[PDB]
């Protein structure tokens, strides 16, 4: 199976057309672009019929099997599109996909969309059956580090001029949402035919629609950026994330930090990182955390986390977000007079 990125998909399609294409990722924009490119190439090759189905427990696989088996009087060269569930395929879906791969024809072009597959999902009969005749395009949203380059390139290909301040504003306002950023660039191009996009011009037609995950919040806490942590927490609250997930994600790192701080008194940090299986890239940030939090801290934080968990579980309270904000400020170097810690 070939492995590719969205930029190389067009080159591969020009090279030739394969039997099956797998589009796995979490970025709707890149998935849509890849699907559109593949369908345009197929239509150029002579695929004028397309079908789409949604994979779910209440799915009619008989129709799909009949479509695969049946011929066409004149409208041949069929294209089939599948949309996997957000959670991912299960054993029933695994065997259904294996059966579908068994009934594969040269005139049928298969496309699959869904989230990134894990090792357990990857190690499946249907997945291995397509290994010799498949190409997988990875569509992952770039991080904040690589985002400005992507924004600059996208603006360049649209024949627009972006200032550094405008690029920073666009990255800040639409972080983790590339579809919104592309639509914003299109609207800006519509507003200003001359294509000159300055800071005051962009600031007028931009709204905050960022998307985050709990791992981003934990990373912000580790780095020590109060503003970014608060912004991420507010965005997560607006989205409607479950507080328990955030509590567990913070708990894992907090307990790891407590153990490392306790056992680093008479041991080098590198050996501890090696023993605890810390990823190489993260070892940087963790280090500075151990240079910013004392043993007196990381105990008040644990106490506050336990109190928040108890309040959420037994009391069914609604002030979980306030305690989360307090803990976020506590992890950053702030007084946090402890009247709110109940210590």
């Amino acid at each position: 199976m070939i492995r590719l990125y969205p930029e190389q998909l067009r080159a591969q399609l020009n090279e030739g057309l394969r039997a099956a294409y797998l589009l796995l990722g979490n970025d709707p924009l890149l998935l849509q672009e890849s699907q559109d490119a593949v369908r345009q190439v197929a239509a150029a090759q002579g695929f004028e019929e397309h079908h789409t189905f949604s994979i779910d427990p209440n799915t009619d696989w008989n129709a799909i099997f009949s479509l695969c088996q049946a011929m066409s009087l004149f409208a041949s060269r069929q294209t089939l599109l599948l949309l996997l569930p957000e959670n991912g395929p299960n054993a029933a879906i695994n065997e259904q996909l294996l059966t579908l791969t068994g009934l594969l024809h040269d005139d049928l072009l298969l496309i699959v969309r869904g989230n990134k597959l894990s090792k357990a999902q990857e190690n499946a009969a249907w997945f291995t059956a397509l290994a010799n005749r498949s190409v997988q395009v990875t569509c992952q949203t770039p991080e904040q580090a690589q985002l400005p380059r992507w924004v600059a390139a996208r603006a360049k290909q649209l024949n627009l001029e972006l200032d550094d301040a405008a690029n920073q504003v666009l990255c800040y306002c639409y972080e983790g949402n590339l579809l919104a950023l592309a639509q914003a660039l299109e609207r800006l191009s519509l507003l200003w035919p001359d294509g000159k996009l300055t800071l005051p011009r962009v600031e007028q037609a931009v709204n905050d629609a960022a998307h985050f995950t709990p791992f981003h919040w934990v990373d912000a806490l580790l780095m020590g950026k109060s503003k970014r942590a608060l912004h991420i927490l507010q965005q997560l609250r607006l989205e409607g994330s479950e507080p328990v997930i955030l509590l567990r994600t913070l708990q894992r790192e907090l307990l790891l930090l407590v153990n490392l701080k306790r056992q680093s008194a008479h041991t080098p940090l590198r050996a501890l990182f090696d023993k605890h299986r810390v990823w190489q890239n993260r070892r940087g940030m963790m280090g500075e955390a151990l240079n910013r939090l004392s043993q007196t801290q990381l105990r008040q934080a644990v106490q506050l986390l336990t109190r928040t968990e108890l309040t959420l579980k037994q009391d069914y309270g609604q002030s979980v977000w306030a305690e989360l904000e307090g803990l976020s400020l506590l992890l950053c170097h702030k007084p946090l007079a402890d009247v709110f810690i109940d210590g």
């Binding site: 709707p28 924009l29 849509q32 397309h50 789409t52 949604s54 949309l83 579809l179 919104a180 639509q183 299109e186 609207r187 519509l190 507003l191 035919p193 007028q204 037609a205 709204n207 629609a209 109060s226 503003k227 608060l230 912004h231 507010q234 989205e239 002030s319 306030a322 904000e325 307090g326 400020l329 702030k334 007084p335 946090l336 007079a337 009247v339 709110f340």
Partner: protein
């Protein structure tokens, strides 16, 4: 009769729309240059002009003179669209029609050419209420749309739509109308209606609108009814006081400055309407916690409390942290002891008195 202000003053032209320049300018440029997308989506808060702008765009698309951003308003198509009798404009209340069977018949009409219009316009409002099968049918229709049909969507909860639907339409987000624009619109409407008014009443109504023009018009109608055909400062102030439901912040402000009479008056006002005392204590505790967090870092306060941002900022800047902590602890003790008090009101009064005048003695 006199009709209703909200219905009577529907924007019938792009010039009548208040604000929303970043959307109107883009739409006008697109219409002038011929760059028209297949699907448009409009998002924003309540009463910001999503439906009005959608109807104006639909009118502009199918005008007799041509595709223009300034509809004539006199040809038969414009009048029919204004009156809601245009054959080629199909308006779908997705909230009322959610089942797939209802949507299928409406979506199957795309196979017929327009009768008396260049485009066949579908205006689906409240589209976030559709079911999964309806969304699938809509996506299938949008995959291969005929060149002579356009789709306009309006909703207040865009996150409810599938990503597949979102990725195939151009989205415009409307903003709040701000106090000044709302006040100017209210003044213009009252001047056109020949209704006496005062600047202070208009300012109060605009401030109470909270970024919604429909709320402002409803409040203006209620004030006119209360004032007996006139808008006056005293009548509007009394009406707003009747609807006022922010006793927690006022109580906090009165307590912080040690004003017992104001505290008693606020307690009486809260008791006048049906309120839960424990809820009031919880709200006061939350406000104190937010003030403490803001004191720790200015970024703690977000856009959710934009209505009372100034008062919270002033309290954070003025009050020392120690007083805030003392009040928070006193209110915690009061909430803890509330169940065993002789009465809920008596418990709240005792706790407020203790916060006002007394200081607990801690061990050691």
């Amino acid at each position: 009769s006199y009709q209703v202000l909200a219905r009577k003053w529907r924007p019938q032209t792009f010039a009548d729309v208040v604000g929303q320049e970043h959307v109107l300018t883009a739409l006008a440029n697109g219409l002038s240059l011929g760059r028209i997308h297949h699907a448009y989506l409009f998002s924003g808060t309540r009463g910001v002009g999503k439906t009005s702008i959608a109807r104006l765009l639909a009118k502009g698309l199918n005008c007799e003179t041509g595709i223009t951003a300034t509809p004539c308003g006199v040809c038969d198509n414009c009048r029919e669209i204004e009156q809601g009798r245009f054959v080629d404009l199909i308006e779908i209340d997705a909230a009322s029609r959610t089942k797939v069977e209802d949507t299928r018949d409406l979506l199957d009409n795309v196979q017929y050419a327009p009768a008396r219009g260049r485009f066949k316009v579908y205006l689906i409002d409240e589209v976030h209420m559709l079911s999964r099968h309806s969304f699938n049918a809509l996506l299938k229709t949008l995959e291969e749309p005929p060149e002579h049909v356009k789709f306009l969507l309006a909703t207040t909860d865009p996150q409810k739509l599938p990503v597949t639907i979102l990725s195939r339409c151009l989205q415009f987000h409307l903003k709040a109308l701000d106090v000044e624009q709302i006040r100017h619109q209210l003044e213009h409407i009252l001047n056109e209606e020949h209704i006496a008014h005062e600047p202070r009443a208009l300012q109060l109504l605009a401030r109470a609108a909270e970024g919604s023009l429909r709320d402002a018009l409803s409040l203006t109608d209620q004030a006119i009814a209360s004032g007996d055909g006139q808008v006056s400062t005293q009548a509007v102030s009394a009406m707003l006081g009747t609807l006022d439901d922010d006793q927690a912040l006022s109580l906090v402000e009165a307590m912080v400055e040690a004003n017992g009479e104001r505290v008693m008056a606020l307690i009486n006002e809260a008791a006048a309407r049906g309120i839960e005392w424990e809820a009031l204590l919880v709200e006061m505790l939350g406000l104190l916690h937010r003030i403490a967090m803001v004191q720790l870092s200015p970024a703690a306060l977000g856009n959710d409390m934009a209505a009372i941002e100034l008062r919270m900022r002033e309290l954070a800047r003025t009050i020392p942290p120690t007083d805030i902590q003392l009040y928070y602890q006193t209110l915690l003790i009061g909430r803890k002891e509330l169940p065993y008090a002789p009465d809920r009101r008596m418990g709240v009064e005792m706790t407020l008195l203790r916060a006002l005048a007394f200081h607990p003695r801690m061990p050691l």
